[PDB]
C-alpha cells in the first residue's frame with residue numbers, strides 16, 4: 001500500500017563526540033568558514049583511498065573513473081552540498097566512523113581548545129567532519145561504497161543520529177554531505193563566498209573542484 005517503506009535506526013553518539021558537537025554547534029567562533037576546507041579535505045582523503053585501490057585493481061572504478069569534488073549551493077532549500085566520488089562508506093563505516101566510536105582525537109581536540117588552540121586545527125585531530133555544525137543545524141550524509149547499497153546518515157546533534165537505506169537518487173560511488181544551514185549562515189550559499197574560501201584554503205587539493213549553482217525552476 002505505501003509508496004515505500006524502510007527501516008530507520010537511531011544511534012546514540014559516543015559521549016565525547018556528543019560533547020564535541022555541542023561545543024561546536026553552540027559556541028561562537030569568528031572563522032566558521034573553515035568547515036568547507038575540512039569537508040573538502042575529507043573528500044580528498046576518500047578520493048585518495050579509492051585511487052589507491054584502483055592502482056592494483058582497476059575494476060574498483062567500474063562504479064566511476066572520474067575522481068572529483070562538487071560543491072552545490074541551493075538557496076531555495078538553504079543547503080550547501082559537498083559531493084565526492086571517493087571510496088564511500090559501508091553501513092558499518094557510517095555507524096563506526098560517524099558517531100559510535102570516539103577516536104582519541106575527539107577528547108584531545110577539546111583539550112587543545114581548552115589549552116588555547118584554535119578551532120581551525122580540528123582536522124589535525126581527525127574530527128574535522130563535525131566542523132559542519134559551525135554552519136549547519138542539520139547534516140545529512142548520503143554514501144555509496146563499492147558492492148554495498150546507498151545509505152543516508154543524519155543528525156541535528158542533540159545526542160543521536162539516524163541511518164537508513166537511501167534510494168532517492170543512486171550515486172555511482174562516493175559521499176554527499178548535505179549541510180542544512182543555520183539561518184544566519186546563508187553567506188555560504190553565495191558564489192563569491194564559496195569561490196573565495198576555496199581559493200584561500202583548498203588550493204593544494206589535487207582533484208577538480210566544481211561549483212554547481214542549483215535553482216529549482
Ligand SMILES: O=C(c1c(O)cc(O)cc1O)n1cccc1
Nearest residue numbers: 039042043046084086088089175
Ligand atoms: O566517505 C568518506 C567521507 C567523505 O567522502 C567526505 C566526508 O566529509 C567524510 C567522509 O567520511 N570517507 C571514506 C573514507 C574516508 C573518508
